[PDB]
Nucleic acid binder design. Structure first.
Lengths: 129, 259, 156, 225, 212
RNA sequence: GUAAAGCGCACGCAGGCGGUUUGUUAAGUCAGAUGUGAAAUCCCCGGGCUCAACCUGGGAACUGCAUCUGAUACUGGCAAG
RNA sequence: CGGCCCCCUGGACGAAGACUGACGCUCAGGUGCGAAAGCGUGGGGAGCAAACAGGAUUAGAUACCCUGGUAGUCCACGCCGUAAACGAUGUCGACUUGGAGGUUGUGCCCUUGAGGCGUGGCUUCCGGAGCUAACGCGUUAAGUCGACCGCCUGGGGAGUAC
């Protein structure tokens, strides 16, 4: 059964990048939306677009720089089987700071740097590079 | 723009599948291959033997136009099925024209009954007939000057199997294959059938309304085993064959050619 | 200007009607002390000829690597067939902490400071290939900025 | 430079069947007509123009062009095109490693040249018959193989090709060496190795001729420049 | 032997046998390195030519692309920074610093001729400051010529020539939309002022008629 | 899959995991504080034995536990969809 | 699991709608089904055939071959609980280029004809990216991921002893 929506998102994105798909669509969720927004802010994607009322569909638009994809790597870290929660000091650095780590915090979902700046940790969703 | 889309549907509108629209201009001749271009993906490897008329020499130079045939695409590279078959549609139209006035008038010269019925030839092709049609009455053209010139007056046609019998004389006078498969049966009714593919044990001449014949390898000639059918007859040619044997059950009519 | 290191040389056999024909394989690697690196794997009946071939092959099909000053830009993994390799940027003075063929390629590359372990197979040929792969895929800050449509200070 | 109507007339828009296509060509395909792929001329034209411009630029800097077609239908035409702009060509079977293994083939060229000289300039006749027949045969072989590229000297600076799938060896060689590739690529073909792809009917003769003629004209222009 | 087997593109050889022999060479980008092959192991082959016909200062330059890169390469072995251009006789105006000019110029009658044939034409070794000195000696002159072009009032002409790049000498063939951004552009009049300059050119041709 | 290693196949309790929206809670989670976490040991900056080991001042650390005050994105609970 | 018929009976798929409203996935123990051989009791017994007997072959022939031939194979009700019980590939879900078929639905289309254009289910082969020690797998993954379980830790001794 479908158990982890976010991870499914990330896999879809990965597969689109692999296959040189322009855009990747999937059912929408708020957490998914926020993640997409974070990615866009962090520039791994061009734009995201949710559409629909009863069952809305998130549609991300993937990014390709000099042929190859932008999202070099994208992994979940927290997962239903095994959750990961980090305190602000302990927060990670993806690719020695070049990549990002999406982290959900009390004040919303943000990149690891942003969280560090804020002064708070939380659940580590995914690494992106 | 939609320029191109409109053109695509235009060019759809100005071509059809069969060999109907005389469009291919002969753009290279060499012996033994003619080639055309009828607005298809590729040029046709035409034989010279589709295009010599009734005495054995060529008739069309560069720029000349005959339609070919279609509905089969790319055996690996190329485009067509041959154009004389197109001529068969014109012959069918001429034969149908009879219906209008109940009399199609051509020359028809029938010397001898291949399969009971005299063979009647229209300009290039020669078709085979059922017995009665050669003569309106018991006149029997065997006493007429050999290969005589009258006309063809249609007595009988099979309407799915191209067997057409016509009346040479007497100007004044004017599932489906397998249930009743007893027409060409009795022992030895000879037929005019185009061969389709030679499978190195066979030739597969099969013309008479969705049947299959095999003149396989043993007769074919008067040598038995060293023969290799491709050397000895043809590809795609109408020949002498007769039944010799019918299964109506396991649909194996085993024709012959040594006759 | 280019420096060249023959990593390994190995005798390989071919059985024939008479007996065993022996030959020699030479695995070399060359580099200019900067980003640029290239390995070559030559073969000949005699050793010196085989190493000569290895040098020739290495000299062509070289590959560039984006070095932050003496070390790498971030931890990087690279694999090839059995040899799976981890290598990690390190502070000036630490030197090349790496084993075997891997070491050699790093030195010619002109990296001076790395912490580096070869997991899995340590078959010199495969492991050097894996190293090269890890070095190639490694991208720089400017490169990622360009990829992502940002400035370097935005990425830090 | 080359108009769309002319290309349509030639039969560029036609492309291979629908069981023989390549999904990397899906962008370049427009539709499928009578179970035959149609190439999108709208997308073909601009890129063809581009490719022409690049070829011209190459010519301007005194670049060496190699014209490859071994389809044996358009071998004559590719040779003619090469000669019109006095460039080089391979109209018969491409020798495996002609470019990568140039140095060996360079000897081959030299032997051919020597044989030609013997034939023509020496005027020495008086050769043992069988030996003379053998030398003649060798000459014919080498002319067939390396006739166009004999005056080439070194390695071309660009590579025009009539079919990618058919000449993939040449393409691969060009990629290994890094020579720019200008390929006519039908729907069945693989355009990944190609730098300046050209979606067009490699098979049809008139289309091939058209492709060649425009290429030759732009080479001549660049030379004039 | 690479050069012999068409691997080292060698165009011209602007060298002065008996003194210095600097020459640039190009190559098909394929990990060849032209100068490197010409030099060898610690100038192995370089020493051969060095003591070949006689003690010569042979030099090799890594040809980049076109003639623009040939200019700097012709100034080697030294330190070029910039250069000017023109039409038929572009006259590569070498732009270096006094400190580096000592080696760049080397000898009054030696590197000034050896590097002159390098591009095939001729070079004019100058100084960084010299460039600027001559650079300004050009801005004032499309203005420094008694202003024989458009002409209207002078108080507006000063404010117009302040923002005006390369004065107005034949500037109508340039962008005729960036001067409208200037504070003060109602009906096409400045676009007309440039037309006046064009008329001034015709007037100059009429002056040629007055003299021819 | 072939190197050791997918139960012969199913159903299914306990257990593990759980679509989507809103509200609420605040258990998990995070932040801050307080209490404690003996001294010695380890580490940092110092000092004293001629140096060192050794001795030694101050810090940091002791990743934890308990409480109180917040945060509520996520996980959980409860209520409605 | 294979001749037809009838009776009782489980599942699958498609077509539209209508409803319920997360009721789901996986599963240690547990429970059930589980080829062939084998066991028990009672029936049956044509053919075949472990065992057995004779004839050959052979150095020997407790085999292969030949002639016979009993358990068994067949039925009923119990037990046994294992097989290279194999796709040597756990189950469920999602995503990622293609081609050629088979089978079984179903929508439209002049079925003008065996057809034309789609859209579902199951299924055979080839092959791309990717993966793989390679062989190969390749939208039915051995690719990219998530949930749960089972299992492995050098060869023998041993899947044996207690």
């Amino acid at each position: 059964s479908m158990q982890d929506p976010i991870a499914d998102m990330l896999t879809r994105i990965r597969n689109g990048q692999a296959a040189n798909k322009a855009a990747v669509t999937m059912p929408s969720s708020k957490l998914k939306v926020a993640i997409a927004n974070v990615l866009k802010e962090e520039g791994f994607i061009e734009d995201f677009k949710v559409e629909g009322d009863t069952k809305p569909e998130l549609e991300l638009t993937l990014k390709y720089f000099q042929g190859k994809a932008v999202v070099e790597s994208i992994q979940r870290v927290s997962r239903p089987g095994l959750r990961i929660y980090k305190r602000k000091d302990e927060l990670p650095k993806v690719m020695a700071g070049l990549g990002i780590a999406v982290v959900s915090t009390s004040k919303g979902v943000m990149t690891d740097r942003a969280a560090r700046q804020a002064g708070l940790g939380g659940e580590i969703i995914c690494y992106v590079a | 723009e939609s320029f191109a889309q409109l053109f695509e549907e235009s060019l759809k509108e100005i071509e059809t599948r069969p060999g109907s629209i005389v469009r291919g201009v002969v753009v290279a001749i060499d012996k033994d291959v003619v080639l055309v271009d009828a607005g298809l993906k590729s040029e046709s490897a035409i034989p010279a033997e589709q295009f010599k008329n009734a005495q054995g020499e060529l008739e069309i130079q560069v720029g000349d136009e005959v339609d070919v045939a279609l509905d089969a695409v790319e055996d690996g590279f190329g485009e067509t099925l041959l154009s004389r078959e197109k001529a068969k549609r014109h012959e069918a139209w001429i034969t149908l024209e009879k219906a209008y006035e109940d009399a199609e008038t051509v020359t028809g010269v029938i010397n001898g009954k291949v399969k009971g019925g005299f063979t009647v030839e229209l300009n290039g092709i020669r078709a085979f007939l059922p017995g009665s049609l050669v003569d309106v009455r018991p006149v029997r053209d065997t006493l007429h000057l050999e290969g005589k010139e009258l006309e063809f007056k249609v007595i009988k046609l099979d309407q799915k199997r191209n067997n057409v019998v016509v009346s040479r004389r007497a100007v004044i006078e004017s599932e489906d294959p397998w249930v009743a498969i007893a027409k060409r049966y009795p022992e030895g009714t000879k037929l005019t059938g185009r061969v389709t593919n030679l499978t190195d044990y066979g030739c597969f001449v099969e013309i008479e309304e969705g049947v299959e014949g095999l003149v396989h390898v043993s007769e074919m000639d008067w040598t038995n085993k060293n023969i290799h059918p491709s050397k000895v007859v043809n590809v795609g040619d109408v020949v002498e064959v007769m039944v010799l044997d019918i299964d109506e059950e396991r649909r194996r009519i085993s024709l012959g050619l040594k006759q | 200007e280019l420096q060249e290191k023959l990593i390994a040389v190995n005798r390989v056999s071919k059985t024939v009607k008479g007996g065993r024909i022996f030959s020699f394989t030479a695995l070399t690697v060359v580099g200019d002390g900067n980003g640029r690196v290239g390995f070559g794997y030559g073969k000949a009946r005699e050793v010196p000829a085989a190493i000569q071939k290895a040098m020739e092959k290495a000299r062509r099909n070289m590959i560039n690597v984006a070095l932050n000053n003496g070390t790498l830009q971030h931890p990087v993994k690279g694999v090839h067939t059995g040899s799976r390799v981890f290598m990690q940027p390190a502070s000036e003075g630490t030197g090349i902490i790496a084993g075997g063929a891997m070491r050699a390629v790093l030195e010619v590359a002109g990296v001076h400071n790395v912490l580096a372990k070869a997991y899995g197979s340590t078959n010199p040929i495969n492991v050097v290939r894996a190293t090269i792969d890890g070095l190639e895929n490694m991208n720089s800050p400017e490169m990622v900025a360009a990829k992502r449509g940002k400035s370097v200070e935005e990425i830090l | 430079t080359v108009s769309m109507r002319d290309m349509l007339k030639a039969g560029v828009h036609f492309g291979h069947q629908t069981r023989y296509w390549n999904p990397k060509m899906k962008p370049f395909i427009f539709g499928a007509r009578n179970k035959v792929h149609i190439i999108n001329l709208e997308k073909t034209v601009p890129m063809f123009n581009e490719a022409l411009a690049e070829l011209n630029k190459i010519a301007s800097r005194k670049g060496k062009i190699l014209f490859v077609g071994t389809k044996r239908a358009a071998s004559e035409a590719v040779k003619d095109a090469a000669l019109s702009c006095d460039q080089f060509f391979v109209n018969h079977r491409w020798l495996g490693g002609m470019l990568t293994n140039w140095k060996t083939v360079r000897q081959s060229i030299k032997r051919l040249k020597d044989l030609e000289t013997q034939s023509q300039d020496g005027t020495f006749d008086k050769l043992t018959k069988k030996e003379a027949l053998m030398r003649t045969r060798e000459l014919e072989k080498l002319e067939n193989s390396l006739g166009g590229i004999k005056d080439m000297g070194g390695l071309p600076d660009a590579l025009f090709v009539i079919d990618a799938d058919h000449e993939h060896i040449a393409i691969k060689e060009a990629n290994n060496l890094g020579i720019p590739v200008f390929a006519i690529v039908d729907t069945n073909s693989d355009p990944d190795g190609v730098d300046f792809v050209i979606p067009g009917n490699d098979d049809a003769i008139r289309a091939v001729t058209l492709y060649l003629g425009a290429v030759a004209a732009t080479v001549r222009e660049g030379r004039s420049q | 032997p690479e050069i012999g087997e068409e691997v080292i593109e060698i165009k011209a050889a602007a060298r002065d046998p008996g003194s210095r022999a600097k020459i640039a060479v190009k190559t098909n980008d394929k990990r060849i390195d032209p100068v490197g092959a010409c030099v060898g192991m610690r100038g192995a082959r370089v020493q051969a030519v060095s003591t070949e016909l006689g003690g010569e200062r042979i030099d090799i330059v890594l040809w980049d692309d076109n003639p623009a890169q040939f200019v700097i390469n012709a100034m080697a072995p030294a330190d070029v920074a910039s250069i000017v251009v023109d039409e038929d006789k572009h006259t590569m105006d070498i732009a270096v610093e006094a400190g580096n000019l000592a080696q760049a110029i080397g000898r009054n009658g030696q590197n000034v001729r050896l590097a002159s044939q390098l591009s095939g034409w001729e070079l004019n070794v100058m100084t960084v400051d010299d460039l600027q000195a001559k650079h300004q000696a050009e801005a004032h002159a499309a203005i420094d010529t008694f202003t024989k072009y458009l002409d209207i009032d002078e108080d507006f002409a000063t404010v117009l020539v302040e923002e005006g790049f390369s004065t107005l000498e034949e500037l109508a063939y340039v962008p005729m939309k960036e001067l409208l951004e200037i504070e003060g552009l109602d009906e096409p009049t400045v676009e007309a002022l440039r037309e006046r300059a064009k008329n001034a050119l015709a007037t100059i041709a009429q002056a040629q008629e007055e003299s021819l």
